Each structure stands twice: as structure tokens, then as C-alpha cells.
Design an enzyme around this catalytic site. Structure first.
Site, PDB file in Angstrom:
ATOM      1  CB  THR A  79      -0.936   0.011   1.208  1.00 29.56           C
ATOM      2  OG1 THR A  79      -1.921   1.039   1.042  1.00 29.56           O
ATOM      3  CG2 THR A  79      -0.153   0.274   2.484  1.00 29.56           C
ATOM      4  CB  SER A  80       0.059   4.770  -0.839  1.00 34.39           C
ATOM      5  OG  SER A  80       0.558   6.049  -0.486  1.00 34.39           O
ATOM      6  CG  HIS A  89       3.572  -2.109   4.227  1.00 39.22           C
ATOM      7  ND1 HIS A  89       3.318  -3.431   3.931  1.00 39.22           N
ATOM      8  CD2 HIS A  89       2.378  -1.476   4.172  1.00 39.22           C
ATOM      9  CE1 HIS A  89       2.027  -3.589   3.707  1.00 39.22           C
ATOM     10  NE2 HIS A  89       1.434  -2.418   3.847  1.00 39.22           N
ATOM     11  N   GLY A  90       6.483  -3.837   7.040  1.00 39.62           N
ATOM     12  CA  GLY A  90       6.662  -5.246   7.320  1.00 39.62           C
ATOM     13  C   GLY A  90       5.476  -5.827   8.066  1.00 39.62           C
ATOM     14  CB  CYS A 110       2.453  -2.085   8.777  1.00 39.84           C
ATOM     15  SG  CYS A 110       2.709  -0.307   8.905  1.00 39.84           S
TER      16      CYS A 110
END
Ligand SMILES: NC(=O)c1ccc[n+]([C@@H]2O[C@H](COP(=O)([O-])OP(=O)(O)OC[C@H]3O[C@@H](n4cnc5c(N)ncnc54)[C@H](O)[C@@H]3O)[C@@H](O)[C@H]2O)c1
Lengths: 422, 210, 58, 169
Positions: free
Chosen positions: B28-29, B87-88, B129
Site C-alpha cells: 500500500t501507499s 510496511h513489514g 505494520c
């Protein structure tokens, strides 16, 4: 003469089919749930009739869950489905054209040169692909469209500072669809964060039930959608089922005593149990509407949703000119910068330090991910930016050309090698 | 005892921030994140640290700069802080190109290989995340599983980072360090949860920022 | 189906039946808005838009 | 601030020994803390998962905390911690659940797993500091001094999720 009515309605049916074939061909819910249609450039009436087939099953399924009902709530189902509805847009753009309203979708607006800045994201165009629709928020009060909108907010977002109320008798509404929540966020806000705390606050211990209760918890997101015919029964027929599975005194206090006063005692009931949403197809144009200024517009959203007549009225000195220019440097607002570059006369000393609220320096902001090349060109070949100066605060030791080559911006790397050396 | 952070200056603060991700990996952004690095840079630089912000690093750049900051010098420095915002999903930090395991980052800071940093704190703030590498005087603080279901009114920042920065600007002058991380646990638990950070501590003494 | 087929009285010729006359009839005979009419005409526009070829739209 | 530790009666301290002076060392030091000590001797390789499951069945509402010293040498704690999640074990809510282990970690609300190396150095230091310092330092600091003593003489790894401090006085 009067035979032009058939073509006038046939083509309005024709234009609405394509915005439905897009959603029933793309998207993943309709692929997974069996509601998908084969992709084709030219759609027919297969796309339109599929909405009718899917809306009846949504109405029938909730109908079967309830029995034959009783006469007590006849003053509820009949009260709702015989009222007046007025939709509300609440956008920050310029949608007046003197005495019309050319509100456009996201696909139509992006089909050609645009003045966009809406609130669509990736996934919305992939999971659902409903970007060819004009969204509205419903008002159940049934008062005049010229009085006021008393619900200034959808689920949580405040989509704009200018509400565009339209009667639900418009010919363009006949092909939309209704959803009791946001079509991508299948979750009602409840109690603590729901608007009008003076109402929900006075009535406790149902806000837990209205808290987060999703709709059609089968695939956790397979939202129910209703036709124009079935949009009035469902908001009341679902309201009874929620009441049936509820336990309170507001159950009997202000749901069966508000039937006489369908104003602030009915708008606040339906706007707290559910969160309605209407989706008109590609374009909604009419001369019968109202523009209510809710709150004064700020300067940030006059830049994002490009509105030059309002923006020009907002700026007064060069101090706001650079702030509006710093807003245009981000978001890649090509049109805003060109407008500001014609009125005021800036200098390289202005863009020497990031103003409050900005987290990047001038050279990094120009070469960011979504930054614009037009503003970069107008800064390099104007004596305002040093092409080869290195970053000193964030990712230090690098230059602009590093950003262009990381993010894969061939149109910016070519611009940098030309207007400078790097 | 204590760490005796009376050296001429405290160590470094390194912030890694990944928001824009390669579309090949399918991420995702992750908007509303550059405010966090703004809070973190001001907060840590406030005490004594030399903050180094590094936006959008690669799979190899994270490993390489750590091998560069490991073997430079720390004889005049008191501590060392590292912050990771990515964003892991698993207990591994995802680079913009490919996943990177947490173990490789910390191997350069062991007392065997970083004798300039021995008997000194090595903090590690992770905001994903738990394949923890055991070594004395380390301290990891994971904060995974966000998802409080913000509507189209997108979240401005993140619960863990803003709570960490808020409680540390006043209390980190007389209230220890593990006495602060518990309050960060409490503030996220009570006021926000209508999942929780973990404090994997291996410090052999206490830590006072004064 | 035939009623909407034969309602196009202002045709003159089978294949050539709209040209831009569709733009004329809608805004002169009803109160349609031009911003919507031109988008309406955008569909079914192959520069001649034969009537029979547009009845495969069902 | 800190956990409120002055209930009428103090929680269980079930010491599941397995296979020895450390067990007697633990029994005396946790008796001084006015606990309730329940020594269970050697068990099977699957032992008694019901032993602490039945503990999660009584009324701990009069008990202020809980300790489970799993001293062993193939049952994971994920099938043991699940009995104290606070929803199916609402009696033990908002109150410490300490798991002192010596030979995967489940994140929960209020837990503390002081896993250690494979009497031993860990237990000898753990009991000594509680004998001395358990009047001013919170449970975090006693675990820190124990952390120092073991390594300086293969290290304890404290994992905690407690939302408040913890004092034994
Ligand atoms: N606007 C609402 O009241 C509303 C209501 C319910 C749900 N939603 C949801 O929130 C999201 C927001 O959608 P959105 O309504 O902001 O639109 P959008 O993301 O699809 O983009 C449309 C943007 O273009 C603007 N625009 C329309 N016509 C224009 C014109 N002629 N010139 C310049 N700009 C023009 C619209 O104001 C809007 O700002 C939607 O995807 C929907 O999921 C919105």
C-alpha cells in the site's frame, strides 16, 4: 416533438449502462461473489438489468429474515417510503457555471484534462471500480432544499465546504443505487464518534449496537446495494430489523413518536443507525439545486481541489502567495503554479526555508515522488533552484537526479540533465 | 549501577522511513507517515542526538549504511538509537525492494564486532505494520498490527510513534526508560483501543537520559 | 423495442440519421443541459451512428 | 501509575518443578512474599495442561496477581497462556501474570516472560535480589540486576507487556 422524450430517456439509459458495466466487469467482490460480467468496450442493457436482479435479492433476503410484521411499525415503514429525500454533495470545487451544476465522476474527469483532487484511492479502482459514479449523502427530513443541510458530515470525512443539495425527483437519479454504508468501508460509526452527540448522548446503550455493526457479514465486505425503486423500503425495513434486535426505551420513545415530526426527530434517527450513500452515474447536471456555504474555505483545499476564483480571493499579500506556492509545489498542482506566477513576482530568497507545516527542503520537494515537472522547469530556468546543490537534511549527500532515477521518472531526469548539469 | 552517559555527546539517532514501495512487491501507499519522522527527528535531536533521516531506502541500502554507521567511531558517544518505520508484516522489516530480516542489522553491533560500542545502550524502535537476536545491552520495542479502521478521514500519524514522542518529551528527564515504555503501552491500550507494543529488554543496567 | 427504433423520425436517411441533429433536438424540445447533452452524444458517435447498428445495444 | 497490590489474599505461585535446591529456594522466597505456593513434582512429557486450566476456573477476584514458575529441562505456552487471555479468564483482568521460565512468544495484555538459559545462576541471583531489594525497586529493576549478575559471572531475556508498574510491597 414529444417523440424526443423517447430518445431523451433512451440515451440517458444508454449512458448509465457503461458506468455499471465497468463495476460489474472489473472489481473483485463481483468476481468472487459471482456478480461479474465479461469485459467489453461497448456494454448493453445486460449491465443495467443485473442491478435490478442483485437489488431484489438484497431486499428479499432481509425481507425473509423478518416475519409478517405488525401494525405498530406501519407508522414506520409507510412513513419512510412516502417521504421526501434530498441528496448532498459537499465538495470544495467550482460547480456552479452560473445557474447549472456540472458535477462529474472520477473516470469522466480524468478522461480528459481535469480539475481533480477528490478522495479516491487505489483498490477502490481495483476491489470495486466504482470511480465512474457521483456520490451523495442522503437527507430524510423532507424539508425544502433551500433551508439548510443539518448533517454536515458523512461517516467521518468532511468532504468539502460547499453542500450541493438536489431533490430526489431529478430524472438523473433514476439510475443510481443506494448503500447503507460506504461502499468500501462497510462499517457504521457508532455512538462515540457519530455526529450529533446531543442526540446519541441522550440515548445510551444502543451506541454499542450501532458501534461498528457491518452489513452483509458474509464476505465481510459484500455490501448490499438497492435500486431507486427499493432504496426507500430498505432503509426502513432494515431499520425495523435493527430495532427488533435492540433493547432500549428509545426503541419506543423516539422511533414511534417521531412519525408525526419527520424533521430533526427522523433525520437524526436514520443518520445514526445507518450511513446512507447514493451513487448517480457518470454525470449529474441540473438547474434545480442549491449551494449552501457551510464553513469558510481554507487555503489548502482551494489548492488541492483547484479553484482559482476562490484561491484568488484568499490570497492578499505575497506572504500567502509563497504559502500557496509551497502547497502547489507538493501535490503537483501545475495549474495553481501557473496562476500564481502571473500575479505576484517571487524571488529565490523566498524559497530558502520550508515554512511551518512543511517537512522537506525546496530541492527535495521538487524531486519528490508525485511532484510536477512543470514547476521544476519553472524553478530551474528562473534562477530559483540550484540544480546540483545536495540535500542536507533528509537522505543527505544526494542530488535531485538521484530522486528522479530512484523513482523512475524519465520525464524528470531528462528535464534535470537539460536545465542543469547533474 | 547505570550507563554513565557523561561522555562529551550522546550517540547517533538513525531514522529509516519507507512510504513509497515498489509495485512489484504489492504494498500500500501508507500515507500519513512523514509526520512521524518529523516528530521523531525533533524529539530525539532535542536531547542530544545527531538525527540522520533516510527516506525510502532499498533492500541493500539499509544493510550497507548500518555497516557504515557501525564501524565509524563511538568512543566519545554515550548511546545509539535506531528507528524503523516500514510496511513489514512478520518480525522482519520490508525494504522497498525485498524483505530484510532484523538479525542482519544487529550483527554489526555485537560486542564482538563493534568493540567501540560495548557496555553502552543499543536501542531499536521498530514500527511494523519475533526472531530476537540475544545480546547484552540491546533493547527492541516492536509495535505491530495497526488497523483501527480509519475511514476516508485518513490517519494523520500512528498511535505508537506519537505516544512514544509525547511521553518522552517531558518524562524522559527523571523517569527512567522502561518506566516510559510501560506508559506508552498504557496510553495505546486505554485511550486508543476503544495490538500492543512489546518490550524485549536485555539491558544490564538502567537508562537515564539526564 | 420497435417504438424506440422508429421514434427517430428526424432521420432523413437510414444510416445517416443524426449527424449533429441529435444535439439540436434534445436541447430544443426539452430542457436538457448542454454539458450533459454533449456527453450523451459522445456515445454512439462513429461519425454517422447508424440507427440499426445502435439497436444491438439491447 | 503502578498496579494495586493490596488485595485480601495473594495469587497462586504454582511452581511446576521438572526433571533441586533451586525449587526449595524458590519456595521459601515466594512464601515470604505472602503468596500461595503449590509445588508440583516431576510430570510427563505432556504433563498436566489441566493443572493451570483448573486454576483458571476458580475465583481469582480475591487474588491480586499470578505466578507460574515453569522450571523444566514438549508443551508450548501458547496452549497454556490461552487460559489466561482475560476474556475467558475475566477473573484475572488488569493484573500481573508473571511466567518465570528456565530451560514463540504470545503477545497479550498483561504478561511477563523472563525466559532464561538452558542451583543455576539465574535462580540463585533471582532469589537473592528479591531477598534484598524487594522494598524500593519495582519488578523491572530486580530483573535488571539479575540480568547484570548472570552475564557478568547466556543471558536472561525479559519480555513484558505490563501497562503499569509492579511493586511487591
Ligand atoms: N462527496 C460525498 O459526499 C461522498 C458521499 C458519500 C461517499 N463518498 C465517498 O468518498 C469518496 C469521495 O468521493 P468524492 O465525492 O470526493 O469524489 P472523487 O474521489 O470520485 O473525485 C471527484 C472530485 O472531483 C470534483 N469535481 C466534480 N466535478 C468537478 C468539476 N466539474 N470541476 C472540477 N472538479 C470537479 C468533485 O468535487 C470531487 O472533488 C468517494 O469515493 C466515495 O467513496 C463521498
Amino acid at each position: 416533438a414529444a417523440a424526443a422524450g423517447k430518445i431523451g430517456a433512451f440515451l440517458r439509459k444508454a449512458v448509465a449502462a457503461q458506468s455499471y458495466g465497468l463495476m460489474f466487469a472489473n472489481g473483485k467482490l463481483f468476481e468472487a461473489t459471482g456478480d461479474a460480467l465479461e469485459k467489453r468496450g461497448q456494454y448493453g442493457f445486460s449491465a443495467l438489468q443485473r442491478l435490478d436482479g442483485l437489488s431484489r435479492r438484497n431486499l428479499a433476503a432481509v425481507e425473509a429474515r423478518l416475519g409478517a410484521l405488525d401494525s405498530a411499525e406501519r407508522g414506520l415503514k409507510e412513513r419512510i417510503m412516502t417521504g421526501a429525500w434530498h441528496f448532498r454533495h459537499q465538495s470544495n470545487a467550482a460547480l456552479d457555471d452560473g445557474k447549472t451544476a456540472a458535477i462529474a465522476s472520477n473516470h469522466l474527469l480524468a478522461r480528459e484534462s481535469r480539475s481533480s483532487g477528490g478522495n479516491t484511492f487505489a483498490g477502490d479502482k481495483a476491489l470495486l471500480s466504482n470511480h465512474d459514479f457521483v456520490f451523495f449523502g442522503v437527507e430524510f427530513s423532507g424539508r425544502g432544499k433551500q433551508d439548510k443541510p443539518l448533517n454536515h458530515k458523512h461517516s467521518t470525512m468532511d468532504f468539502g465546504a460547499n453542500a450541493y443539495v438536489v431533490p430526489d425527483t431529478l430524472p438523473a437519479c433514476r439510475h443510481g443505487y443506494l448503500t447503507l454504508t460506504d461502499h468500501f468501508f462497510n462499517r457504521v460509526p457508532g455512538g462515540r464518534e457519530a455526529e450529533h452527540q446531543d442526540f446519541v448522548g441522550s440515548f445510551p446503550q444502543m451506541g454499542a449496537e450501532t458501534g461498528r455493526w457491518i452489513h452483509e457479514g458474509k464476505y465481510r465486505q459484500n455490501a448490499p446495494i438497492f435500486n431507486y425503486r427499493d432504496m426507500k423500503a430498505a432503509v426502513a425495513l432494515h431499520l425495523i430489523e435493527f430495532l427488533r434486535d435492540s433493547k432500549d426505551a428509545a426503541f419506543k420513545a423516539y422511533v414511534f413518536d417521531q412519525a408525526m415530526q419527520s424533521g430533526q426527530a427522523l433525520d437524526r434517527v436514520l443518520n445514526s443507525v445507518f450511513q446512507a450513500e447514493f451513487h448517480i452515474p457518470r454525470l449529474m447536471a441540473t438547474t434545480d439545486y442549491a449551494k449552501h456555504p457551510l464553513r469558510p474555505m481554507l487555503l489548502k483545499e482551494a489548492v488541492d481541489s483547484v479553484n482559482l476564483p476562490a484561491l484568488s480571493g484568499l490570497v492578499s499579500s505575497k506572504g500567502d502567495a509563497v504559502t500557496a506556492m509551497w502547497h502547489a509545489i507538493d501535490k503537483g498542482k501545475d495549474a495553481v503554479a501557473a496562476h500564481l506566477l502571473g500575479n505576484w513576482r517571487f524571488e529565490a530568497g523566498d524559497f530558502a526555508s520550508a515554512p511551518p507545516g512543511f517537512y522537506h527542503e525546496l530541492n527535495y520537494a521538487l524531486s519528490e515522488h508525485g511532484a510536477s515537472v512543470y514547476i521544476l522547469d519553472q524553478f530551474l530556468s528562473r534562477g530559483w533552484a540550484a540544480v546540483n546543490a545536495p540535500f542536507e537534511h533528509v537522505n543527505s549527500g544526494e542530488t535531485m537526479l538521484d530522486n528522479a532515477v530512484k523513482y523512475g521518472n524519465r520525464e524528470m531526469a531528462a528535464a534535470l540533465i537539460k536545465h542543469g548539469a547533474d | 549501577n547505570s550507563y554513565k552517559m557523561d561522555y562529551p555527546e550522546m550517540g547517533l539517532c538513525i531514522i529509516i522511513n519507507n512510504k513509497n514501495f515498489h509495485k512489484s512487491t504489492g504494498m500500500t501507499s501508507r500515507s500519513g507517515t512523514d509526520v512521524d519522522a518529523a516528530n521523531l527527528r525533533e524529539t530525539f535531536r532535542n536531547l542530544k542526538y545527531e538525527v540522520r533521516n533516510k527516506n525510502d531506502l532499498t533492500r541493500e541500502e539499509i544493510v550497507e549504511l548500518m555497516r557504515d554507521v557501525s564501524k565509524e567511531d563511538h568512543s566519545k558517544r554515550s548511546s545509539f538509537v535506531c528507528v524503523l518505520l516500514s510496511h513489514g508484516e512478520e518480525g522482519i522489516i520490508f525494504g522497498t525492494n525485498g524483505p530484510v530480516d532484523l538479525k542482519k542489522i544487529t550483527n554489526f553491533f555485537r560486542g564482538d564486532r563493534c568493540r567501540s560500542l560495548t557496555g553502552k545502550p543499543k536501542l531499536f524502535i521498530i514500527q511494523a505494520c519475533h526472531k530476537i537476536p540475544v545480546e547484552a545491552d540491546f533493547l527492541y520495542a516492536y509495535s505491530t498490527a495497526p488497523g483501527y479502521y480509519s475511514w476516508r478521514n485518513s490517519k494523520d500519524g500512528s498511535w505508537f510513534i506519537q505516544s512514544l514522542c509525547a511521553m518522552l518529551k517531558q518524562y524522559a528527564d527523571k523517569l527512567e526508560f522502561m518506566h516510559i515504555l510501560t506508559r506508552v503501552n498504557r496510553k495505546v491500550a486505554t485511550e486508543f483501543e476503544s495490538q500492543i507494543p512489546c518490550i524485549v529488554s536485555m539491558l544490564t543496567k538502567e537508562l537515564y537520559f539526564y | 423495442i420497435r417504438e424506440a427504433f422508429r421514434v427517430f423520425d428526424k432521420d432523413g436517411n437510414g444510416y445517416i440519421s443524426a449527424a449533429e441533429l441529435r444535439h439540436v433536438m434534445t436541447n430544443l424540445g426539452e430542457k436538457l443541459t448542454d454539458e450533459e447533452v454533449d456527453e450523451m452524444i459522445r456515445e454512439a458517435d462513429i461519425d454517422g451512428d447508424g440507427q440499426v447498428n445502435y439497436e444491438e445495444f439491447v
